[model samples]
Target: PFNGTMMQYFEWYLPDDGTLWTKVANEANNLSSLGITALWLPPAYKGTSRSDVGYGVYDLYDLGEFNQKGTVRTKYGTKAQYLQAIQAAHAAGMQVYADVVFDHKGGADGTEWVDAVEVNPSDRNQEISGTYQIQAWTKFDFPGRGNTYSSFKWRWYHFDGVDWDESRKLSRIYKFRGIGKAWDWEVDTENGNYDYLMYADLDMDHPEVVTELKNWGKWYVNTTNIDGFRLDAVKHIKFSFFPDWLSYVRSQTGKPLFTVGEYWSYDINKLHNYITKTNGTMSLFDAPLHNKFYTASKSGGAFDMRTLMTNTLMKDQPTLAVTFVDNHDTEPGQALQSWVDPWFKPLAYAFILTRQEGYPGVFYGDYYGIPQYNIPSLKSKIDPLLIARRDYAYGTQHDYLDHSDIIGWTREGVTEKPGSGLAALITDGPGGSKWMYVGKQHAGKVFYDLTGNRSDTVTITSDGWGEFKVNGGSVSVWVPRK
Candidate 1:
């Protein structure tokens, strides 16, 4: 999973803004040492009068100029500073990806009106705009009032500490019952109208919406020079819009765009359908694998690498699923955070990165609060293991023989190269030694374990077969050739 390490949603006004920038600069400077090449930052555009966490955009061109928290011209910093950050990152050879919200606007409507006072409405033509028009019915705060929309109203179900309140479940749509309009805003008969919610579902079939998205795509490529985009709430957007949007982007960039979707559903059927609708435009994140990683790592058991191999075998276009451990929406580094087992992380990454498909994306975090120790630190120590799989890591050919908590199955390697192959043979439990069938990659030669450097010489038949006895709770990667 060493394609590059990505830092998520770096906010400029947050208390750690200076530290965050320093951290980013330091990481970029040492990327080669850490083996990282990509960095993703949140939208730095001009924001609205209110605090929507930079998602509510007042002006795309101004880029947060109105909300001046510092001496900089914009909300983030001076144009010179922004350019400096870019230059420093590029000098470090890191590819930058900008997260832009294009679906909606921050104010009440798509256009700007003088002295309206209320926030600027979103451009329905844009993709990242909010859905709800009126924020009245929703509680600004569940037990408190001050904020814009109530927390209770935003949530679909009530999770009041003890249990889920199934009765209060409500779709995010607006409706009227008696004394007044069901919702604050009038619903359009042609296009469905709701209230203030980002990740809005646009009517992709609408000609105006498509034109708007295409225009946004043009602006993104020409203005940002960003390497790729991580599309938010893709499933919420119209499925058809994806293909057209991707085609337009690809046409402009003249290269395959590295767009990953936030399709959160884990059901293979749902995932497969979403993949099919990509129209050769975008890719997906491996939500299923993410679920498994969280489950196994949190549960403190042997990581199940087989689950990944099985999922890859089932994907329509396996390469499209971007591999990851944790993201912004998922568990934060400081909470419920159990996926960073130093031993299992590298092993799990080894299994996924060397698999048939999927572009591996590594997550960056201050591991164990060791200052500035991000994914790059993890990469330097595991490059050899990655190198072992690099030659044959391009295709999706998994073999699931038999697996359990202690011993797992074998995945075939690229056999085109004689006496050179790889396999993920895991051993757990208290067994002193466990034997696994490995292909003839090691026949009549002395082989060393990449993980532990255990060595053995084996005489084998023409079939190219051998056995490896490994210690429990350990993964041994045996390579027979240089």
Candidate 2:
């Protein structure tokens, strides 16, 4: 019964000076003290270039060790510094989750002549051009890695499709329909087949490709000593491939590796279906909840507070949901930009952190501020909520989601944690008060707003009920003063 919290430790606009790993190593103790149970670092492999954010994967074997991609060190730092960061986090009793990208490969070493048919960019099911010879960038020899950790050599056969044809210089999805080659099954059927997401879509059906990926996964877990993984672009990969691969790694390593997938769909049923298809092997980000938060924040106080958790994966499958407000992808100018308004961020944080259901994740950009975007840090508002989650958020829970614009909840506390019960109230329209029960044990106890938005104190009657106060368009968490 150990609840945990996670922190995504990187933003999109981080400096490219190769000091991120060192900074993480230095802040391990502070992060652990702040109740961060796990840290999800950005992609650690070599990208197309040193300045690349590590999503455009170039060499899976190079972790800032090989002299590839025009640089010896990645955007974070050298391999030595990365290892030190992981070690430091472990020493501080915090788990490190490495970001893993396996959907596609980018920045090939050279081009190869292959038979492919160009499909319409809008409708991938319609073949616009017949099968013909075209120069495609599907060869990845990894000369810099030179059979270092992995001896796997990628060729055109390992991939199912490509975006750009080197010969015609045309930008279109060209699926390789050579003899015995077809699009992988059990994938997202969007745009006919979403299996070909980006450059050099990996074919999971290829025996050699499957074996190599499984080997690489085992080697990666053993090499980094990582506690878990944050799987990238899982929706683009074959759905059935993960079950076997994850079971293989777990069996080989003999450790239960925690994993969370980025499905990136706002549909709750799709998310639930994915969980069922994976056989509950991995948890998924609460994307539907995040969309709801964004919509509510932009509704100008007209959104119903009672429907906050409606139609969300977090509400139905809390155990398999990793709730988050925002991340590097959802920042101001990123691909999936649905940022929650700064004014409503405190309420959003309180809702996730103080809730008894899902595991909450804090974004680094929100905690430290995105200087590139001119957005200030929300540390002052979120720190108190984190403290409350660490110390006072426990025991039996109560919900007050009866009002349209005002809502509140309370915790009855447990015997082991004395004075740990709390009352939280939030309003989007105006200030309001709700009579909530603290506990029968504290018949005559008094509580004050820990958020400091309200200075008034509420005295509990003999029946253990008190009126909790809140501010207009704000949240107030009341706890007994020590």
Candidate 3:
């Protein structure tokens, strides 16, 4: 009953007006009908004002409820609307995952002079400049709220570093100078040390910081009533941070929050290492698979389809891999834009949707398309695939991934769900038919291409095997018609 799909319900180019929560509240039923079992809402906290897309976190407690960061509501909507959206989604029988940003805090209330050394951006451990007093923006008083929700003031020592030197008007990665002030070593070894990722990096090792964050997590969960979290910027933060954070939240709430992290690393081993370090408490976004999809899409039919599942978390650790085709960052003009070729998105969705492993995440940008980037919607193509996954994709999976360009798979109908067998064939170059087995029970039954890529139908023979065909550069999902 848990074979559910997730949808990241926000895009990078949504209108600046605060209407997302209302939109989600109204459209929740329609999305649930499309087989999306969960909705991953964007960062609901007040970020760098309303225009900010919830990444540049200013205050975690300010979830469009307080009059901080210029506007009362975040880019989404009011606190009332956010809660309403979650309730509406729940009413529609879909889980809601909150997008949390704890990596760094931006738009500080004031700046304080602190002794720091400008470190090399490429290698943060190597200090390039001598220790000096630099004005760092680390103070957060939250004048609008005025200690309304857990009055905890943020000081200079609360964080380990900052980017801008307000006193000198310089932009650099400044690591604070003090005893036990070194960068968190349990993070990624990128750029020498990737601990400090812009704005004011919180000292996760600090006891007060940890306690405050845990308290905030509890408050947010109780306030919004979210089912789980889509933890943002996990690679930059301490590896051990989330383990304890999640433990404390689950202990207090007594709810098993389904969490996923955005590590953003293409290397499979690093992802595996993070999973190991976190004790496998939460799933991670399958970034390496997305990287493969990007490469295969760009290769223009040269990349081998056989290796499409190679060097990916979905293949190695399928249970803990949250697969996705694209997201907000991967859109046209975002920082981490690696938009998969539009022509190949249908095939990509088919591969992830009908597979027997990995929790697939559908992107809002893909489902609705990006209007600002002039991209059209893929809803028409992805709808049939979603239905096939929800209705017909079940039982043991039979993969025919031996070919370089054309590969296929079949799902035998389960006893719980009758008339559920399907044969899905896809290709990056030229395509043909693949003789695969659906099941002996499906013999003499006719199957239609749910994707409409193939109009021809073939009745299952006396044996379990059937010939499933696909067109060039397309995917054909053949499901039982009767």
lDDT of each: 0.47, 0.89, 0.91
Query: What lDDT tens digits, residue by residue, belong to model 2 across residues 322-400?
Result: 9999999999999999999998888988888888888899999999999998999998888888887887888888988
On a 0 to 100 scale, what is the lDDT of residue 117 in model 3? 93
Model 1 alpha-carbon drift over 4 Å, by segment: 1-15, 18-39, 44-59, 62-95, 103-213, 253-255, 298-316, 333-344, 366-401, 406-421, 427-442, 452-463, 480-482
Candidate 2 residue 2 C-alpha distance from true site, Å? 4.2
Question: What is the model-wide C-alpha lDDT for candidate 3?
Answer: 0.91
Best by TM-score: 3
Alpha-carbon runs more than 4 Å astray in model 3? none
Ranking by lDDT: 3, 2, 1
Error in Å for residue 67 of model 2: 0.4
Better of 1 and 2 by TM-score: 2
> What lDDT score goes with residue 422 in model 3?
90
TM-score for each model: 0.64, 0.98, 0.99
- Count the clashes in each prediction: 35, 0, 0
- Model 1 C-alpha lDDT per residue in residues 174-217, reported as the tens digit of each score: 22112221211222212333232442223344455466557667
